[PDB]
């Protein structure tokens, strides 16, 4: 097993626990500005390029940053009216885990959690995928 046992690392590795403690997310953006104007600036920033968006984990100093690809992954308004859904994959501790979550466009207080990604988990690599388990499994 090479894909099912780092599937089993999501069962076991507690830094995947600490990432996935079903925790809240919040857009901490223009916080010095008053509360009503920033949802416009959030909505202006979501679907155009040339900008980033932040998502704090609300308990830690962890954040998710969506840089434009000039510097799967989507930021969109078309799912529901007045609410944006977020989803993006990443390669965290060598394994392909996708992060997804929702955020209330009016409160800017939402919920997000990353689940392990199985579909392009065949699209990992052959041996240089295991190169991080020349370091993770292979400790010294």
């Amino acid at each position: 097993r090479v894909v099912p046992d780092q599937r089993s690392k999501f069962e076991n590795e507690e830094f995947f626990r600490k990432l996935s403690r079903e925790c809240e997310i919040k857009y901490t953006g223009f916080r010095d500005r008053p509360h009503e104007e920033r949802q416009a600036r959030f909505q202006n920033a979501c679907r155009d390029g040339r900008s980033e968006i932040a998502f704090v984990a609300t308990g830690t100093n962890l954040s998710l940053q969506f840089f434009p690809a000039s510097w799967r992954e989507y930021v969109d308004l078309e799912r529901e009216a007045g609410k944006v859904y977020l989803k993006a994959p990443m390669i965290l501790n060598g394994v392909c885990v996708i992060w997804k979550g929702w955020i209330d466009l009016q409160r800017l207080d939402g919920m997000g959690c990353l689940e392990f990604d199985e579909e392009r988990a065949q699209q990992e690599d052959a041996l240089a995928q295991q190169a991080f388990e020349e370091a993770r499994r292979r400790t010294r």
Binding site: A54, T60, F66, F67, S70, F132
Partner: protein, 133 residues
């Protein structure tokens, strides 16, 4: 619609521990050379405008990088003023982004095999928030 959204898991930190990270790595590169093989490339060798300076550390076969961000977005706990860090190990155009609690254990595989003058540059000392705890 528009482009995709390249993610990097950026640990937001303070202003001050960044400017003690830039003083310990610059200590352990030039004047002391305990771990001298860390190519600290400068500002305008990058394409992402929110990059301060990568720390390319060639770790045996391939390079681990530790990059510094500035002016992202303001944080939740009244000091996280847009400056963060995202550690990333790439293997010949295959990129992963790693645990800080394991990354200092991953420099440990090469540096070093052993009140200290000075302490070794450990990223776990960097990324601990002085406000939530």
């Amino acid at each position: 619609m528009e482009n995709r959204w390249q993610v990097m898991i950026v640990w937001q930190v303070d202003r001050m521990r960044i400017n003690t990270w830039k003083r310990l790595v610059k200590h352990h590169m030039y004047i002391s050379r305990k771990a001298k093989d860390w190519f600290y490339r400068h500002h305008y060798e990058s394409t992402n405008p929110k990059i301060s300076s990568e720390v390319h550390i060639p770790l045996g076969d391939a390079k681990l990088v530790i990059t510094t961000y500035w002016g992202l977005h303001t944080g939740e706990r009244d000091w996280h003023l847009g400056q963060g860090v995202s550690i990333e190990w790439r293997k010949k155009r295959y990129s992963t982004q790693v645990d800080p609690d394991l990354a200092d254990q991953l420099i440990h595989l090469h540096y070093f095999d052993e009140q200290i003058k000075p302490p070794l540059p450990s990223v776990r000392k960097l990324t601990e928030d002085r406000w939530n705890k």
